[PDB]
Design a protein around this ligand. Sequence first.
Ligand SMILES: [Ca+2]
Ligand SMILES: [Ca+2]
Ligand SMILES: [Cl-]
Ligand SMILES: [Cl-]
Lengths: 278, 273
Amino acid sequence: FQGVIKIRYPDDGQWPEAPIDGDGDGNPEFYIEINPWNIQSAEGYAEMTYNLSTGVLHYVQALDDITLKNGGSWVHGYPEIFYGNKPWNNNYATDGEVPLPGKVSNLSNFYLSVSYKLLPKNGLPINFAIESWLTREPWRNSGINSDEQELMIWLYYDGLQPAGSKVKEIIVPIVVNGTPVNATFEVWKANIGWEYIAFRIKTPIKEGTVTIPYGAFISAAANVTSLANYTELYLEDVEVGTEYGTPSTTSAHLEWWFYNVSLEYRPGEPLLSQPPAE
Amino acid sequence: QGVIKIRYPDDGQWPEAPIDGDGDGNPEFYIEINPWNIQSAEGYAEMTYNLSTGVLHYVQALDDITLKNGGSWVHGYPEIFYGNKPWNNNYATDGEVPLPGKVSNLSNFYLSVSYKLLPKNGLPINFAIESWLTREPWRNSGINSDEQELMIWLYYDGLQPAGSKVKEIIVPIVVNGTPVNATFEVWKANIGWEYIAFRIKTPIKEGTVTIPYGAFISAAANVTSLANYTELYLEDVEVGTEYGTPSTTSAHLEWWFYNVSLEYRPGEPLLSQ
Ligand SMILES: [Ca+2]
Ligand SMILES: [Ca+2]
Ligand SMILES: [Cl-]
Ligand SMILES: [Cl-]
């Protein structure tokens, strides 16, 4: 009896995507993409289903004989669901609590909650990667420039390493399965035609419920940035997905569930605060 | 008499101009001061093209430079180029070589530059020829992950290419009329696109240098991790000087490009080995 929004690769082409619009206003609450952005040719399939009655996002992938677009780029793809304005295509989803896009100097704090269970097969290198783009303009569709930032938050990883160098270690208070815990994150800094900041947790979480304060990561990235006028940047979106694959990986079998992805806004509390504990 | 002058920071923060000697509307070349990583600075930068003599003269006297992306290392890239620049709306296609053209469709061509460099106070600079290779011919919005940045360094001082050195190659070039086998370091960085930089191991601060562009395109076709490399579009040929480091606050620079010339070779394939 469940209504389902299903996208499938390669049946739906090379960019399978669909908006999640329960209220039918034309502005989606979220946007799902299979996003195999580095897959150049592949045998097999990938499929993502969003259950409209239960809200669970399901993704099943069984790709073989992978040819990559840029072997340099390492990762094969990034199947995801995001809220906000994705700066890399024309998709957006702003029907939500947190006013994204918005300047980090004007934005208030918010908490991201995720409930998931990951199943990489045959030791496929994967991660659970929350990522955000910070651009000089609010409604970007053409990509990222050198004076802009990519902010990543890795909640799980296996056989995968962030770009650049580990420059710091911070401690962010998060909630894992209802219990609050002081989590240590590795602060990785790469410069790849834009500033790349990745916060890799030291204890990967393969399944469960994790809630994080986003402002703790925005302030930490502000604390290590090499960008001028950081606070003038527009926080574009919050993307939640799983990177996977390496240049030496020709088969990528993967399945996971996102039982919930939600963002609670905190009006009045500043998003930019002091740096987290070291 | 007859001088095209662009200046910084007077003509805004993107001082640029076409070079249209015959006034037909299509530029033969395009000049940009291009201080793309400069957020704030004091002083001036001036680029002058004498249409009568054909010499390009660049004077720069910048101080208290605050970088826009410190991790991007360099401050800018004052340049002249032919073809289609993918990072803005500028283009210049009144010339022999059909740029932008597909790599598998294009013929070979030789690039000649005669120049003299004057970095002041040990300012880290290079003499960098660079080209972009995109999927669509008329790009104006940037570069994607499945595209390439190709660089050829004829001179450098205190500057190192991005990424890491992969190997060295031999390319036959002509220096001051004498043909010579030059050795280039092949540097490979993957920074949101593929970045290939051919840095000569004997830097040349002044003189005339002629290079075969097909030698570098074919070499890049050999080290690339991009699929369907031959289907990319050779966007343009950019000739300029990168300069500066994150710790560089004062950057004084002067150079002359006495000639920038392209000779097409119809019927001669661009790709070979
Ligand atoms: Ca809606
Ligand atoms: Ca003309
Ligand atoms: Cl398609
Ligand atoms: Cl705003």
